[PDB]
């Protein structure tokens, strides 16, 4: 019971931790688009 | 002050010399005969390896010991372990939802790691 | 046990985070390092 | 793997956003004897086995059956009255002696609550410094990144 709860806890923590990687990554990827688009335009 | 098997408050506690942990004699003596090793550390341990007062105030209304008290004890044992079996089943199901969602995130990161650096690379190339 | 684990997986991720940006920076420096030279060669023609 | 918790001061919308992207990638992937049998059946059915509801009621002028039931009530009442005598002899001394044991048992738990509290805050304390170390280094990197970005333009 408790030995599985350790796996549950370590996962959920690391999941939402890994989830924040995406939030960061997505906004930087987005920044690269408008930058290049507005530059390639002119 | 407690036993490290049942969750008791032992009447004859005995400590093992391989892993310092106090068990109630009956429960540790049973484990060694089942499989001769220490339950916690999984180290070699025998009955001879082991090394050997509590007051409960019997209630004022102490018939009930045969009927009411004994009934409650086997109710409380029954409905707890059943509910504990229910808890173990959900932890394994909620495990599967954890690992799947984790691996789902891994694929996003891997997909976005190719995306970002190539978008950055394109800005470096744009200058030329 | 969470914060224990969080420490061990995070501490490794940082080197990888930095090392990526470190190499990302190295490439950026090269473009900077060359673009000057073309400007420098404007004075040679004069 | 890397996502700075202490340094990234990350809205609820970003959790809701990232949850949807994680959700879309999940759309894609999709030892005892007879004792155990009766115990599991008792818990599942939600019914405890009935005990002897007999000693309490009984009835006078019964028969040979109530002659037994009567004689049961006597011996247990004498055992009862003897079982109340040895309790009252000690009285409250036996009770308060066990009350003291319970206070020694309680304080031990809350000592472990502190030991865990300290080491848990101690691990987080070490993480904090790491977060602030690298967060600066990332800040340094981005500044240099933006410098090139405009530098390369102004050369061309």
* Displacement of CA D80 from its chain's centroid (Å): 40
Look up residue D91 and give its DSSP letter. Answer: T
Class of domain B1-54: alpha beta
Q: Report the distance separating Cα D41 and Cα D43, nearest Å.
A: 5
Angle at D132 between CA A26 and CA B117, to 5 degrees: 30
- Give all strands (DSSP E) within B1-128, no chain letters: 13-15, 22-24
Q: Report the distance separating Cα D45 and Cα D125, nearest Å.
A: 51
Sign of the dihedral through C-alpha D68, D69, D70, D73: positive
Tokens of D117: 């509290």
Looking at CA atoms only, how far is residue D93 from chain A in angstroms?
40
Chain A and chain B share a number of CB contacts under 8 A equal to 61
The beta-carbon neighbor of A24 closest among D1, D3, D21 is D3
Q: Report the distance separating Cα B107 and Cα B86, nearest Å.
A: 33
Cβ pair B112:A12 closer than 8 A: no
Tokens of B123: 């800005």
Q: What is the DSSP string of D93-108?
A: HHHHHHHHHHHHHHHH
Cβ–Cβ under 8 Å, residues D26 and B104: yes
Cβ pair C2:A13 closer than 8 A: yes
Which candidate in A9, A13, A19 is best for mutational testing of the C interface (most C CBs within 10 A)?
Answer: A13
Looking at CA atoms only, how far is residue D106 from chain C in angstroms?
24
Cβ pair C31:B120 closer than 8 A: no
Q: What is the DSSP string of A1-42?
A: -HHHHHHHHHHHHHHHHHHHHHHHHHHHHHHHHHHHHHHHH-
Tokens of C1: 């046990």
Q: Is B9 helix (H, G, I), strand (E, B) or coil?
A: coil
Listed resolution, Å: 3.6
Q: Report the distance separating Cα B11 and Cα B26, nearest Å.
A: 10
- Please state how this structure was obtained: cryo-EM
Q: Is D53 helix (H, G, I), strand (E, B) or coil?
A: coil
Residue whose tokens read 């673009």: C35
Tokens of B59: 């209630």
Q: Report the distance separating Cα A7 and Cα B99, nearest Å.
A: 9
Closest CA to D54 of D71, D30, D35, D39: D71
The partner residues of C7 in beta bridges, in order of sequence, read none
Which candidate in B30, B34, B55 is best for mutational testing of the D interface (most D CBs within 10 A)?
Answer: B55
Q: Report the distance separating Cα D5 and Cα D131, nearest Å.
A: 8
Closest CA to D91 of B57, C8, B56: B57
Residue of A nearest to C17 (CA): A21
Task: List, in order, residues 6 or more apart from C9 with CB less than 8 Å away.
Answer: A14, A17, D1
| Cβ of residue B12 closer than 8 Å to a chain A Cβ | no
Name the pairing type of β-strands B22-24 and B13-15.
antiparallel
Residue D76 CB neighbours (<10 A) = 14
What are chain B's partners, defined as 3 or more CB pairs within 8 angstroms? A, C, D
Closest CA to C21 of D77, D31, D137: D137
Q: Which residues of B touch A3 (CB under 8 A)?
A: none
| Cβ of residue A14 closer than 8 Å to a chain B Cβ | yes
Q: What is the DSSP string of chain C?
A: -HHHHHHHHHHHHHHHHHHHHHHHHHHHHHHHHHHHHHHHTHHHH-
Cβ–Cβ under 8 Å, residues C2 and A13: yes
Helices B68-126 and D12-29 pack at an angle, to 10 degrees, of 100
Which candidate in D26, D31, D49, D144 is best for mutational testing of the B interface (most B CBs within 10 A)?
Answer: D26
Q: State phi, psi for B23 to the nearest 5 degrees.
A: -120, 160
Cβ pair B124:C35 closer than 8 A: no
Q: State phi, psi for B22 to the nearest 5 degrees.
A: -85, 125
Q: How far apart are the first and last CA of chain A?
A: 62
Burial of residue A14, with CB atoms counted within 10 A of its CB: 0-12 exposed, 13-18 middle, 19 or more buried: buried
Q: Report the distance separating Cα D19 and Cα B16, nearest Å.
A: 50
Angle at D108 between CA D104 and CA D111, to 5 degrees: 140
Which candidate in D25, D53, D100, D105 is best for mutational testing of the B interface (most B CBs within 10 A)?
Answer: D25
Closest CA to D147 of C32, A39, B119: C32
Tokens of B122: 């394109």
Q: Report the distance separating Cα B38 and Cα B23, nearest Å.
A: 11
Q: Report the distance separating Cα B113 and Cα C24, nearest Å.
A: 13
The partner residues of B14 in beta bridges, in order of sequence, read B23
| Cβ of residue D97 closer than 8 Å to a chain B Cβ | yes
Cβ pair A24:D22 closer than 8 A: no
| Cβ of residue D123 closer than 8 Å to a chain A Cβ | no
Residue whose tokens read 């009862």: D80
């Amino acid at each position: 019971l408790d030995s599985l709860t350790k796996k549950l806890s370590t996962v959920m923590y690391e999941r939402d931790a890994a989830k924040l990687v995406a939030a960061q990554l997505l906004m930087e990827k987005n920044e690269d688009s408008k930058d290049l688009p507005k530059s390639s335009q002119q | 002050m407690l036993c490290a098997i049942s969750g008791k408050v032992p009447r004859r506690p005995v400590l093992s010399p391989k892993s310092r942990t106090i068990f109630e004699k009956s429960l540790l003596e049973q484990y060694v005969k089942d499989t001769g090793n220490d339950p916690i550390t999984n180290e070699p341990l025998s009955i001879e390896e082991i090394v050997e007062s509590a007051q409960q105030a019997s209630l004022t209304e102490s018939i009930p010991n045969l009927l009411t008290s004994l009934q409650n004890e086997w109710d409380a044992i029954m409905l707890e372990n059943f509910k504990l079996r229910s808890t173990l089943d959900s932890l394994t199901k909620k495990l599967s939802t954890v690992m799947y969602e984790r691996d789902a995130a891994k694929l996003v990161a891997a997909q976005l790691l190719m995306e970002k650096n190539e978008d950055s690379k394109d800005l470096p190339k744009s200058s030329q | 046990s969470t914060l224990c684990h969080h420490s061990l997986p995070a501490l490794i991720e940082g080197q990888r985070k930095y090392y990526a940006d470190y190499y990302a920076y190295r490439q950026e420096i090269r473009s900077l390092e060359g673009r000057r030279k073309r400007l420098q060669a404007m004075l040679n023609s004069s | 793997m890397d996502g700075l918790s202490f340094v990234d001061k990350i809205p609820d919308g970003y959790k809701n956003e990232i949850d949807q992207l994680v959700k879309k990638e999940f759309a894609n992937i999709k030892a005892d004897n007879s004792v155990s049998t009766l115990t599991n059946a008792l818990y599942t059915e939600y019914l405890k086995q009935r005990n002897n509801k007999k000693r309490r009621t009984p009835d006078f002028n019964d028969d040979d059956d109530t002659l037994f039931l009567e004689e049961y009530r006597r011996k247990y009442p004498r055992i009862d009255t003897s079982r109340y005598i040895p309790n009252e002899s000690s009285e409250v001394s036996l009770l308060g002696i066990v009350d003291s044991y319970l206070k020694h048992q309680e304080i031990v738990l809350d000592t472990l609550l502190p030991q865990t509290v300290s080491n848990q805050w101690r691990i987080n304390n070490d993480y904090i410094r790491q977060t602030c170390t690298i967060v600066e280094e990332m800040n340094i990197q981005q500044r240099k990144q933006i410098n090139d970005l405009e530098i390369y333009r102004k050369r061309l």
